[PDB]
Design an enzyme around this catalytic site. Structure first.
Site, mmCIF file in Angstrom:
data_model
loop_
_atom_site.group_PDB
_atom_site.id
_atom_site.type_symbol
_atom_site.label_atom_id
_atom_site.label_comp_id
_atom_site.label_asym_id
_atom_site.label_seq_id
_atom_site.Cartn_x
_atom_site.Cartn_y
_atom_site.Cartn_z
ATOM 1 N N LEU B 37 0.874 -1.161 0.000
ATOM 2 C CA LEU B 37 0.000 0.000 0.000
ATOM 3 C C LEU B 37 0.917 1.218 0.000
ATOM 4 C CD1 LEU B 37 -2.200 -2.191 1.756
ATOM 5 C CD2 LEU B 37 -3.195 -0.038 2.416
ATOM 6 N N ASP B 38 0.338 2.400 0.158
ATOM 7 C CA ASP B 38 1.132 3.601 0.363
ATOM 8 C C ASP B 38 1.405 3.785 1.849
ATOM 9 O OD1 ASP B 38 2.451 5.998 0.271
ATOM 10 O OD2 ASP B 38 0.786 7.165 -0.544
ATOM 11 N N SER B 39 2.598 4.300 2.149
ATOM 12 C CA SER B 39 2.988 4.485 3.538
ATOM 13 C C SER B 39 1.925 5.233 4.318
ATOM 14 C CB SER B 39 4.323 5.224 3.627
ATOM 15 O OG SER B 39 4.198 6.556 3.171
ATOM 16 N N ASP B 41 -1.132 5.093 3.934
ATOM 17 C CA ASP B 41 -2.258 4.206 4.199
ATOM 18 C C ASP B 41 -2.012 3.330 5.420
ATOM 19 O OD1 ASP B 41 -3.547 5.275 2.071
ATOM 20 O OD2 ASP B 41 -3.015 3.671 0.673
#
Ligand code: NAP
Ligand code: SF4
Ligand code: SF4
Ligand code: SF4
Lengths: 319, 80, 57, 176, 114, 152, 208
Positions: B37-39, B41
């Protein structure tokens, strides 16, 4: 010829005219022509001061007012002579003690379907209603479906419009309810059967016109206006009490502008969903808007704060 | 104060968000060498286990978790 | 003292809006209006942007 | 230099302190002025009874605009584009274009009457001495579509009284 | 470049920070949404917050990522209090403004040379 | 039949003969409003009593310059006023903004914010073309509330 | 020359040469230039490091009092490659003089607050954060003064086109006062006044 960008103080080449355009609908269209640039010549009948709340709508030297009666065949001929498109919202509810109401959907929409056709307007427009059927109903709902027949003769190019029961901000449709603090809510007629119609939100209709206002290529070809999903329940009259938690009038008060123990009670339950084959909306789109989300705004009552509203509806069936 | 307290609460939450993890409810999930995921997130997940069950993670903790193991465990030694 | 050397090409972002990448500025030496001979209107390198439509009101 | 105010000390002796205890407790002050200095109403009121009577002014007053013309009329303005270029507010707008004979005059001349800040910078830059601030406060119409002026509103508004204007400058022009 | 940074050092404490005040926004959207007596779907209020924080994504540098914060750290002062009257807030979600075409052939019939 | 049109020689003579103006001080123009209520040109006692609270008024008055941060305030106040309301701007800065008309933080014009009726033009209007601007608004009620009920 | 030309006075120009000679003498870690304005005022060009330090020396001493802080301000110059500027301005009540302290900067490089030295830079530092964008660290408070709540542009710098980017107008379609992009009714004409021939020989820029 359109110049620049559509912000304000721009051109965009279209003139217009909008008859009526005082009460609920017309005020809310012109406000979308006081932005993308226009020349909106709004005439009006009797009201000197009720038209002011409008004026900060077009920038400067855009909208311009005249005076007219409408049974004089000249008053509609002095304005329109310079125009591009002209729509018509005119007409109302209850029979007047003066205007006998019979031909005000017949003679008036033709009286302005006089020299307008002659003088070289184009993309002339008129309004219909989703529920008006020339079979026998309803005393007001009738005479409206006559215009679809009687008036369509003139001006072979119309793109006459057919929307549903609409809910605005100041509108009288969904507001007849919740004004019903009264001996009790009595549905029409004490039956939970055929409610409700296709309640489209007033923005989408008023964004339809200006989407057909230079469409192009819709003239003569009539359209009808989809609602949201889907039909609806009795709960709509409960939904009112679900969230609500239970022009030129006078100086003092009027004599009669009633609830009309007449067509009014039976005009709301006439339902008759009708022909799908009309294009009629996404083609003219792109718009469709729900109910559950947009009905808090227009409804604010004596709590004015609490909401906490979880209750929804299926469709409901016949769906 | 039970290891059936902190394994029950955790494992359904990670399913409840509408985003990436599709029943990786295995307790090891290692986040972006793992699923990804994105950090930012990952920094969302931390919060809803606090308003629930009561807690903070004030500190550099949320940067090291990387797996519902550690979070359970860091909760395990925290409450009991 | 926290001197902390590094190199990142200086840029700045967010203050204007879409006019960052849409346009092209220009850097030019003004040319001396020729109806007169005064040479002192030169000497500074200004800049001025592209011209977009002016319409009529 | 200096002065010192509110630097004093009470005397502190029983000839005085009665005089300050005949004051607090008997109100011998505080009826001195507003028992009296208020009344003192018996002076003639000062009011300019408005719809009829009116107040003073001076020949240098500023106000509604005009454009004069000489004896048999030339529209004294030559359109030299000055009263336009000193204008702080930038109300003025001028467009010349050579008139038929070949003497130049205007076409559009518009003083906005909202923007104009009433300097007295457009009375004082015109070398041919045309444009002149009138001394009449006739104003106040009901629509902002209006106060913008064209040329052919001005001239009349400046030929409605030239018996007012042409007799002020000949008081005032000897100073400047 | 040699100048003292503001708060962060490189990118981590920085990108711990942007993660942080997110929640102060994320935890408080709605207390306002009943407080101003403004009516919207409370999830909108959680879309915009997450719509903005994803916006400026390409930032390569400290002291930029700290600069933006000092703005963002402020707003929670005004909004979590009432220094705005309904109309400094709702301006985020632009109701009235007619759409821009942004496509090609929709331009070519309206407006010159953008 | 004719009684109505004779009735509006009462109600349309009542609303014009007693006005309860709000004022907005903001900028220079406020002082040349005061001197309308000072004794020279005496505003009150010519039928118009001076300032009252926001709720009780009829004719609000805009002086001064309207920046951004003042617009959210005005709009709101104009509402709460009762029915028979008007808006009479004055000064060269409620008409399109004096100068400052090109600035960044000044709304341009104060017609844009509300449906304004009568105008007056100049840094300070001379405390005269004020009253001259009202004896427009007491003559701008020739209107009749007849011929809305009683025609249509 | 006498009748219309302002008569000069020398004495004031001798001392403010001296007294300013040696504040380049006793704080050379900081001060990088000093000079005398032909009207008898001083300008001390100081590195951005000393700001709290130098004033503090100017804050108290028996040879320089400078207790009264009068005017903080700024100037913003493009093509100076470090944009902005500060100018402090201080009056020393005993010795009757004005000595101004110029310190450059950029947007990104912070400068340190003067607030513990004088408590009258409390406001004058809140303002500048609004206008130009300079960011003063360790300031008891930092907020928005002189400007509305919407301006994201920091106007007085040289990139803000005079009319800001959003005009305002009220519409009755709902009940707010909302903001639509700026559409004028007159161009704001741009005149052009700058005349040739270089009437000033003394200021003549380097020959190049
Ligand atoms: N599309 C829908 O959902 C819907 C729903 C209900 C009704 N309608 C009909 O579609 C239009 C919507 O009207 P509305 O929502 O704005 O309500 P409305 O109250 O009927 O608005 C009509 C305005 O025009 C005036 N008017 C009435 N007859 C007139 C005539 N012959 N000539 C000129 N003006 C006349 C009315 O009084 P004044 O003369 O004093 O101005 C009123 O001011 C109307 O024709 C209405 O009958 C449509
Ligand atoms: S009056 Fe003087 S300034 Fe005004 S136009 Fe005629 S000449 Fe040019
Ligand atoms: S009157 Fe004052 S403002 Fe109007 S133009 Fe002449 S100078 Fe400029
Ligand atoms: S001129 Fe502009 S500022 Fe001076 S008073 Fe009239 S309006 Fe207020």
């Amino acid at each position: 010829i359109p110049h620049g960008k559509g912000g304000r103080s721009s051109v965009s080449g279209i003139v217009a005219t909008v008859f009526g355009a005082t009460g609920f609908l017309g005020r809310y269209v012109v406000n979308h022509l006081g932005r993308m640039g226009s020349q909106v010549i709004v005439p009006h009948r009797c009201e000197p001061y009720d038209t002011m709340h409008l004026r900060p709508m077009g920038d400067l030297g855009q909208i311009i007012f005249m005076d007219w009666n409408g049974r004089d065949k000249d008053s509609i001929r002095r304005a329109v002579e310079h125009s591009s498109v002209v729509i018509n919202l005119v007409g109302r509810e209850w029979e007047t003690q003066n205007f006998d109401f019979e031909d005000v959907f017949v003679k008036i929409p033709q009286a302005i379907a006089q020299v307008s056709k002659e003088a070289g307007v184009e993309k002339f427009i008129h309004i219909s209603h989703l529920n008006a059927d020339i079979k026998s109903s309803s005393k007001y709902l009738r005479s409206k479906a006559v215009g679809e027949k009687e008036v369509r003769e003139t001006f072979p190019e119309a793109t006459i419009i057919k929307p549903a029961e609409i809910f605005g901000r100041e509108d009288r449709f969904l507001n007849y309810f919740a004004n019903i603090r009264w001996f009790g809510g009595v549905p029409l007629i004490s039956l939970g059967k055929k409610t409700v119609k296709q309640p489209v939100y007033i923005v989408d209709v008023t964004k339809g016109i200006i989407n057909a206002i230079k469409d192009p290529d819709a003239r003569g070809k009539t359209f009808a206006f989809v609602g949201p999903s889907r039909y609806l329940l009795f709960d709509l009259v409960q939904y009112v009490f679900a969230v609500a938690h239970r022009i030129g009038r006078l100086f003092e008060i009027s004599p009669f502008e009633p609830w009309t123990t007449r067509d009014k009670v039976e005009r709301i339950h006439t339902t008759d969903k009708i022909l799908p084959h009309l294009p009629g909306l996404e083609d003219l789109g792109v718009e469709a808007t729900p109910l559950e989300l947009k009905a808090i705004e227009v409804l604010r009552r004596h709590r004015t704060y609490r909401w906490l509203s979880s209750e929804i509806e299926d469709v409901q069936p016949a769906k | 104060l039970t290891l059936e307290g902190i394994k029950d609460r955790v494992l359904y939450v990670l399913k409840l968000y509408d985003k990436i993890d599709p029943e990786k409810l295995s307790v090891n999930s290692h986040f972006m060498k793992d699923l990804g995921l994105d950090s930012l997130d990952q920094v969302e997940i931390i919060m809803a286990m606090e308003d629930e069950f009561g807690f903070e993670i004030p500190d550099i903790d949320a940067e090291k978790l990387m797996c519902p193991q550690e979070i359970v465990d860091y909760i395990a030694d925290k409450k009991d | 003292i926290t001197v902390d050397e590094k190199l990142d090409i200086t840029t700045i972002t967010g203050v204007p809006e879409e006019h960052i990448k849409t346009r092209k500025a220009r850097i030019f030496v003004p040319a001396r209006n020729n109806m007169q001979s005064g040479v002192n209107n030169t000497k500074k390198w200004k800049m001025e942007f592209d011209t977009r439509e002016r319409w009529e009101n | 230099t200096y002065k010192y105010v509110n630097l004093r000390e009470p005397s502190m002796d029983m000839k005085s302190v009665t005089d300050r205890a005949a004051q607090t407790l008997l109100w011998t002050e505080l009826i001195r002025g507003l028992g009296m200095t208020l009344s003192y109403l018996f002076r003639e009121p000062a009011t300019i009874n408005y719809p009829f009577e009116k107040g003073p002014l001076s020949p240098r007053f500023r106000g509604e605009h005009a454009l004069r013309r000489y004896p048999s009329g030339e529209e004294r303005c030559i359109a030299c584009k000055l009263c336009e270029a000193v204008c702080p507010a930038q109300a003025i707008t001028i467009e010349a274009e050579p008139r038929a004979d070949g003497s130049r005059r205007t076409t559009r001349y518009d003083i906005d009457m909202t923007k104009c800040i009433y300097c007295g910078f457009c009375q004082e830059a015109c070398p041919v001495d045309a444009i002149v601030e009138g001394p009449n406060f006739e104003f106040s119409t009901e629509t902002h579509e209006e106060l913008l002026y064209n040329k052919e509103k001005l001239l009349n508004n400046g030929d409605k009284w030239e018996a007012e204007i042409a007799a002020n400058i000949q008081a005032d022009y000897l100073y400047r | 470049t040699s100048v003292k940074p503001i708060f962060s050092r490189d990118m981590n404490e920085a990108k711990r920070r942007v993660r942080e005040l997110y929640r102060a926004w994320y935890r408080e959207v709605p207390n306002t949404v009943h407080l101003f007596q403004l009516d919207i779907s409370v999830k909108q209020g959680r879309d915009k917050v997450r719509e903005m924080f994803k916006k400026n994504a390409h930032i390569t540098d400290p002291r930029v990522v700290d600069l933006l914060v000092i703005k963002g750290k402020m707003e929670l002062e005004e909004t979590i209090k009432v220094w705005k009257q309904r109309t400094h807030v709702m301006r985020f979600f632009h109701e009235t403004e007619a759409p821009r075409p942004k496509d090609f052939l929709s331009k070519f019939y309206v407006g010159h040379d953008p | 039949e004719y009684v109505v049109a004779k009735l509006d020689d009462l109600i349309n003579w009542a609303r014009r003969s007693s006005l309860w103006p709000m004022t907005f001080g903001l900028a220079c123009c406020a002082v040349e409003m005061m001197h309308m209520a000072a004794p020279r040109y005496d505003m009150d006692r010519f039928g118009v009593v001076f300032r009252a609270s926001p709720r009780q008024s009829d004719v609000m008055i805009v002086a001064g310059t309207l920046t951004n941060k003042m617009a959210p305030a005005l709009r709101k106040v104009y509402d709460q006023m009762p029915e028979p309301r008007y808006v009479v701007s004055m000064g060269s800065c409620a008409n399109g903004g004096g100068y400052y008309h090109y600035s960044y933080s000044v709304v341009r014009g104060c017609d844009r914010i509300v449906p304004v009726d009568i105008y007056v033009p100049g840094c300070p209007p001379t405390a005269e073309a004020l009253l001259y601007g009202i004896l427009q608004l007491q003559k701008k009620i020739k209107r009749e509330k007849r011929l809305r009920i009683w025609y249509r | 020359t006498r009748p219309t030309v302002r008569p000069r006075n020398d004495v004031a120009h001798k001392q403010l040469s001296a007294f300013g000679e040696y504040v380049a003498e006793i704080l050379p870690k900081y001060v990088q230039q000093v000079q005398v304005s032909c009207f008898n005022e001083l300008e001390i060009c100081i590195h951005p490091d000393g700001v709290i330090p130098v004033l503090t020396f100017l804050r108290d001493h028996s040879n320089a009092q400078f207790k009264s802080l009068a005017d903080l301000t700024a100037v913003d110059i493009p093509t100076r490659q470090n944009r902005f500027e500060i100018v402090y301005n201080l009056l020393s009540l005993r010795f009757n003089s004005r000595i101004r302290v110029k310190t450059y900067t950029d947007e990104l490089t912070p400068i340190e607050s003067s607030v513990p030295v004088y408590k009258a830079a409390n406001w004058y530092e809140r303002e500048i954060w609004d206008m130009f964008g300079v960011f003063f660290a360790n300031h008891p408070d930092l907020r928005r003064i002189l400007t509305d709540y919407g301006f994201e542009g920091h106007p007085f710098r040289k990139d803000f086109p005079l009319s800001g980017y959003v005009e305002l107008r009220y519409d009755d379609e709902v009940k707010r006062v909302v903001a639509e992009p700026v559409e004028l009714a007159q161009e704001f004409r741009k005149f052009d006044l700058n005349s040739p021939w270089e009437a000033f020989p003394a200021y003549r820029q380097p020959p190049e």
